[PDB]
Design an enzyme around this catalytic site. Structure first.
Site, PDB file in Angstrom:
ATOM      1  N   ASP A 240      58.260  41.128  10.828  1.00  0.00           N
ATOM      2  CA  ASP A 240      59.877  41.907  10.735  1.00  0.00           C
ATOM      3  C   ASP A 240      61.242  40.857   9.293  1.00  0.00           C
ATOM      4  O   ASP A 240      61.843  41.399   9.642  1.00  0.00           O
ATOM      5  CB  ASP A 240      60.461  42.171  11.927  1.00  0.00           C
ATOM      6  CG  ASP A 240      61.577  43.384  11.461  1.00  0.00           C
ATOM      7  OD1 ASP A 240      61.032  44.404  11.539  1.00  0.00           O
ATOM      8  OD2 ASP A 240      63.052  43.151  12.220  1.00  0.00           O
TER       9      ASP A 240
ATOM     10  N   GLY B  28      66.348  50.905   9.560  1.00  0.00           N
ATOM     11  CA  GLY B  28      66.107  52.365   9.479  1.00  0.00           C
ATOM     12  C   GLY B  28      65.332  52.681  10.658  1.00  0.00           C
ATOM     13  O   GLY B  28      65.901  53.039  11.888  1.00  0.00           O
ATOM     14  N   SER B  29      63.985  53.068  11.552  1.00  0.00           N
ATOM     15  CA  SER B  29      63.369  53.163  12.769  1.00  0.00           C
ATOM     16  C   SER B  29      61.579  52.764  12.409  1.00  0.00           C
ATOM     17  O   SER B  29      60.947  52.069  10.925  1.00  0.00           O
ATOM     18  CB  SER B  29      63.650  54.294  12.390  1.00  0.00           C
ATOM     19  OG  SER B  29      62.504  55.275  11.919  1.00  0.00           O
ATOM     20  N   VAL B  30      60.899  52.148  13.817  1.00  0.00           N
ATOM     21  CA  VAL B  30      59.302  52.272  13.827  1.00  0.00           C
ATOM     22  C   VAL B  30      58.868  53.633  14.199  1.00  0.00           C
ATOM     23  O   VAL B  30      59.258  54.049  15.575  1.00  0.00           O
ATOM     24  CB  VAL B  30      59.206  50.863  14.624  1.00  0.00           C
ATOM     25  CG1 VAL B  30      57.555  50.597  14.494  1.00  0.00           C
ATOM     26  CG2 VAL B  30      60.199  49.791  13.919  1.00  0.00           C
TER      27      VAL B  30
ATOM     28  N   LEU C 292      58.522  53.837  17.437  1.00  0.00           N
ATOM     29  CA  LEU C 292      58.592  52.898  19.069  1.00  0.00           C
ATOM     30  C   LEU C 292      60.264  52.203  19.211  1.00  0.00           C
ATOM     31  O   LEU C 292      60.188  50.883  19.864  1.00  0.00           O
ATOM     32  CB  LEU C 292      57.183  51.690  18.088  1.00  0.00           C
ATOM     33  CG  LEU C 292      55.686  52.480  18.306  1.00  0.00           C
ATOM     34  CD1 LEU C 292      54.822  51.295  16.941  1.00  0.00           C
ATOM     35  CD2 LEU C 292      55.440  52.886  18.910  1.00  0.00           C
ATOM     36  N   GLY C 293      60.310  52.098  18.334  1.00  0.00           N
ATOM     37  CA  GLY C 293      62.097  51.523  17.848  1.00  0.00           C
ATOM     38  C   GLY C 293      62.469  51.774  17.222  1.00  0.00           C
ATOM     39  O   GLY C 293      62.422  52.728  16.588  1.00  0.00           O
ATOM     40  N   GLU C 294      64.418  52.345  17.229  1.00  0.00           N
ATOM     41  CA  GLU C 294      65.197  52.585  16.670  1.00  0.00           C
ATOM     42  C   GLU C 294      66.802  51.959  16.520  1.00  0.00           C
ATOM     43  O   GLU C 294      66.581  51.318  17.822  1.00  0.00           O
ATOM     44  CB  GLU C 294      65.203  54.005  17.094  1.00  0.00           C
ATOM     45  CG  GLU C 294      65.929  55.204  15.425  1.00  0.00           C
ATOM     46  CD  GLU C 294      65.834  56.491  16.277  1.00  0.00           C
ATOM     47  OE1 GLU C 294      65.771  56.416  17.694  1.00  0.00           O
ATOM     48  OE2 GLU C 294      65.829  57.243  15.252  1.00  0.00           O
TER      49      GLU C 294
ATOM     50  N   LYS D 152      44.475  51.506  13.751  1.00  0.00           N
ATOM     51  CA  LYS D 152      46.204  52.304  14.248  1.00  0.00           C
ATOM     52  C   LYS D 152      46.997  51.240  14.218  1.00  0.00           C
ATOM     53  O   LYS D 152      46.787  49.687  13.845  1.00  0.00           O
ATOM     54  CB  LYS D 152      46.238  51.800  15.852  1.00  0.00           C
ATOM     55  CG  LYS D 152      47.507  52.427  17.070  1.00  0.00           C
ATOM     56  CD  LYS D 152      47.730  53.617  17.257  1.00  0.00           C
ATOM     57  CE  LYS D 152      49.226  53.426  18.064  1.00  0.00           C
ATOM     58  NZ  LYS D 152      48.869  55.278  17.413  1.00  0.00           N
TER      59      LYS D 152
ATOM     60  N   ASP E 177      65.965  36.351   9.401  1.00  0.00           N
ATOM     61  CA  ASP E 177      65.418  37.745  10.427  1.00  0.00           C
ATOM     62  C   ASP E 177      64.617  37.005  11.707  1.00  0.00           C
ATOM     63  O   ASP E 177      64.305  38.095  12.234  1.00  0.00           O
ATOM     64  CB  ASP E 177      66.097  39.106  10.426  1.00  0.00           C
ATOM     65  CG  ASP E 177      66.558  39.796  11.264  1.00  0.00           C
ATOM     66  OD1 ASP E 177      67.026  39.626  12.319  1.00  0.00           O
ATOM     67  OD2 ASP E 177      65.557  41.180  11.685  1.00  0.00           O
TER      68      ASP E 177
ATOM     69  N   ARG F 131      62.493  38.751  19.476  1.00  0.00           N
ATOM     70  CA  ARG F 131      61.921  39.728  19.855  1.00  0.00           C
ATOM     71  C   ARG F 131      61.142  40.109  18.411  1.00  0.00           C
ATOM     72  O   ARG F 131      60.166  41.695  18.249  1.00  0.00           O
ATOM     73  CB  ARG F 131      63.832  41.166  19.598  1.00  0.00           C
ATOM     74  CG  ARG F 131      64.708  40.439  18.435  1.00  0.00           C
ATOM     75  CD  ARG F 131      65.527  41.042  18.399  1.00  0.00           C
ATOM     76  NE  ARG F 131      66.218  41.724  16.814  1.00  0.00           N
ATOM     77  CZ  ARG F 131      66.957  40.223  16.521  1.00  0.00           C
ATOM     78  NH1 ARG F 131      67.575  39.665  17.432  1.00  0.00           N
ATOM     79  NH2 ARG F 131      67.641  40.109  15.065  1.00  0.00           N
ATOM     80  N   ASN F 132      61.291  39.768  17.142  1.00  0.00           N
ATOM     81  CA  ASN F 132      60.051  39.770  16.098  1.00  0.00           C
ATOM     82  C   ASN F 132      59.283  39.312  15.713  1.00  0.00           C
ATOM     83  O   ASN F 132      58.625  39.617  15.196  1.00  0.00           O
ATOM     84  CB  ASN F 132      61.585  39.470  14.414  1.00  0.00           C
ATOM     85  CG  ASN F 132      62.557  40.008  14.543  1.00  0.00           C
ATOM     86  OD1 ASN F 132      62.523  41.498  14.857  1.00  0.00           O
ATOM     87  ND2 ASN F 132      63.333  39.381  13.708  1.00  0.00           N
TER      88      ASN F 132
HETATM   89  C1  LIG Z   1      58.269  43.985  12.842  1.00  0.00           C
HETATM   90  C2  LIG Z   1      57.371  45.556  13.232  1.00  0.00           C
HETATM   91  C3  LIG Z   1      56.076  44.673  14.338  1.00  0.00           C
HETATM   92  C4  LIG Z   1      54.539  45.104  13.801  1.00  0.00           C
HETATM   93  N1  LIG Z   1      54.068  46.577  14.328  1.00  0.00           N
HETATM   94  C5  LIG Z   1      54.399  46.253  15.709  1.00  0.00           C
HETATM   95  N2  LIG Z   1      53.586  46.531  16.571  1.00  0.00           N
HETATM   96  C6  LIG Z   1      53.490  46.833  18.026  1.00  0.00           C
HETATM   97  C7  LIG Z   1      55.070  47.250  18.579  1.00  0.00           C
HETATM   98  C8  LIG Z   1      54.939  47.654  20.185  1.00  0.00           C
HETATM   99  O1  LIG Z   1      56.497  47.909  20.450  1.00  0.00           O
HETATM  100  N3  LIG Z   1      54.119  47.437  21.281  1.00  0.00           N
HETATM  101  C9  LIG Z   1      54.039  47.928  21.887  1.00  0.00           C
HETATM  102  C10 LIG Z   1      53.179  49.569  22.464  1.00  0.00           C
HETATM  103  C11 LIG Z   1      52.324  49.344  23.643  1.00  0.00           C
HETATM  104  C12 LIG Z   1      51.515  50.364  23.838  1.00  0.00           C
HETATM  105  C13 LIG Z   1      52.062  51.548  23.133  1.00  0.00           C
HETATM  106  S1  LIG Z   1      51.579  53.449  23.467  1.00  0.00           S
HETATM  107  N4  LIG Z   1      50.140  53.233  22.772  1.00  0.00           N
HETATM  108  O2  LIG Z   1      51.453  53.517  25.074  1.00  0.00           O
HETATM  109  O3  LIG Z   1      52.292  53.923  23.022  1.00  0.00           O
HETATM  110  C14 LIG Z   1      52.805  51.546  22.235  1.00  0.00           C
HETATM  111  C15 LIG Z   1      53.634  50.488  21.968  1.00  0.00           C
HETATM  112  C16 LIG Z   1      56.210  47.620  17.373  1.00  0.00           C
HETATM  113  N5  LIG Z   1      56.780  47.606  17.592  1.00  0.00           N
HETATM  114  C17 LIG Z   1      58.628  47.116  17.910  1.00  0.00           C
HETATM  115  C18 LIG Z   1      59.664  47.980  17.631  1.00  0.00           C
HETATM  116  C19 LIG Z   1      61.378  47.432  17.862  1.00  0.00           C
HETATM  117  C20 LIG Z   1      60.709  46.817  16.227  1.00  0.00           C
HETATM  118  O4  LIG Z   1      62.076  45.318  16.677  1.00  0.00           O
HETATM  119  C21 LIG Z   1      59.220  45.099  16.511  1.00  0.00           C
HETATM  120  C22 LIG Z   1      58.374  45.866  16.848  1.00  0.00           C
HETATM  121  N6  LIG Z   1      55.784  47.229  16.262  1.00  0.00           N
END
Ligand SMILES: CCCCNc1ncc(C(=O)NCc2ccc(S(N)(=O)=O)cc2)c(N[C@H]2CC[C@H](O)CC2)n1
Ligand SMILES: [Cl-]
Ligand SMILES: [Cl-]
Ligand SMILES: [Cl-]
Length: 256
Positions: free
Chosen positions: A153, A17-19, A14-16, A33, A135, A139-140
């Site tokens: 975050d 530690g990493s997510v 979802l993002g890039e 989920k 932080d 974006r958070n």
């Molecule tokens: C600080 C972590 C936040 C809590 N968890 C979380 N929740 C959602 C996301 C995210 O990016 N959601 C968008 C998304 C929509 C659809 C799909 S699907 N089902 O089509 O594949 C996947 C993701 C998330 N990720 C972010 C990554 C970057 C980071 O800076 C913030 C959180 N994290």
């Protein structure tokens, strides 16, 4: 706080530690989920992981609609912070899509302020328990399924307070500074802070008394609240409890 690794199935990044996304198999048999954030700690000593486990014990007991929940931790030896999944994603990206068709509609001022109240309520919950974010940014801030903002975050020089650049100290008012910038991003719908200024010119820019400019359509009443969070003396800055009520008062003064 620890959860059995076998109860967790990972997937995409979802993002890039990493997510990473994943499915947490709960105790009630239902698969939830969830997002999974990896943590690169210094394993030369049990100093960082100790503080990480201590915070995890507190971050799990938290319960607030404007604060992200912590489900637990999983070990592979790297830890992994398990958090709820947010299909609507972060707030900062949502503001950029609003200025584009197909995506969300032009967000009115009333809706933009509600985000600030939520974030303020979230930080107000953490301030009472003396918990620092260190932080805070747009974006958070994630969006719940009911379109309500929630901070996250909590374990970017333009978000760091002036006192936190020199003495490198972090208090509650240091988050108020970042909260002030967060309000600026929402009002500007995803603009980068301090346009024209570089990250290496910030300390001298703020020290000379300069701050973030007032947006074109932003009310003079809102900028004052935003500017109060950027005062040179942290003691002169207001708490989240004050900011929370100020925004709520300004919000109710407006129509639907
Ligand atoms: C600080 C972590 C936040 C809590 N968890 C979380 N929740 C959602 C996301 C995210 O990016 N959601 C968008 C998304 C929509 C659809 C799909 S699907 N089902 O089509 O594949 C996947 C993701 C998330 N990720 C972010 C990554 C970057 C980071 O800076 C913030 C959180 N994290
Ligand atoms: Cl897996
Ligand atoms: Cl922009
Ligand atoms: Cl500016």
């Amino acid at each position: 706080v620890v959860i059995d690794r076998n109860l967790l199935i990972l997937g995409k990044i979802l993002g890039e530690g990493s997510v990473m996304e994943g499915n947490l198999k709960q105790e009630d048999g239902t698969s939830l989920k969830v997002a999974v954030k990896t943590m690169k700690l210094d394993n030369s000593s049990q100093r960082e992981i100790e503080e990480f486990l201590s915070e995890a014990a507190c971050m799990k007991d938290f319960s607030h609609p404007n604060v992200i929940r912590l489900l637990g931790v999983c070990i592979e030896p790297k830890p992994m912070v398990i958090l709820p999944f947010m299909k609507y994603g972060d707030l900062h990206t949502y503001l950029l899509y609003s200025r584009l068709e197909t995506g969300p509609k032009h967000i009115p001022l009333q809706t933009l302020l509600k985000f600030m109240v939520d974030i303020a309520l979230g930080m107000e919950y953490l301030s009472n328990r003396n918990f620092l974010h260190r932080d805070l940014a747009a974006r958070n801030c994630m969006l719940r399924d009911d379109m309500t903002v929630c901070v996250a975050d909590f374990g970017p020089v333009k978000w760091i307070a002036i006192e936190s650049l020199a003495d490198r100290v972090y208090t509650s008012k240091s988050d108020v500074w970042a909260f002030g910038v967060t309000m600026w991003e929402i009002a500007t719908r995803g603009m980068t802070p301090y346009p024209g200024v570089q990250n290496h010119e910030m300390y001298d820019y703020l020290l000379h008394g300069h701050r973030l400019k007032q947006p074109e359509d932003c009310l003079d009443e809102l900028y004052e609240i935003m500017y109060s969070c950027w005062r040179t003396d942290p003691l002169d800055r207001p708490t989240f409890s004050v900011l929370r009520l100020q925004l709520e008062k300004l919000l109710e003064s407006l129509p639907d």
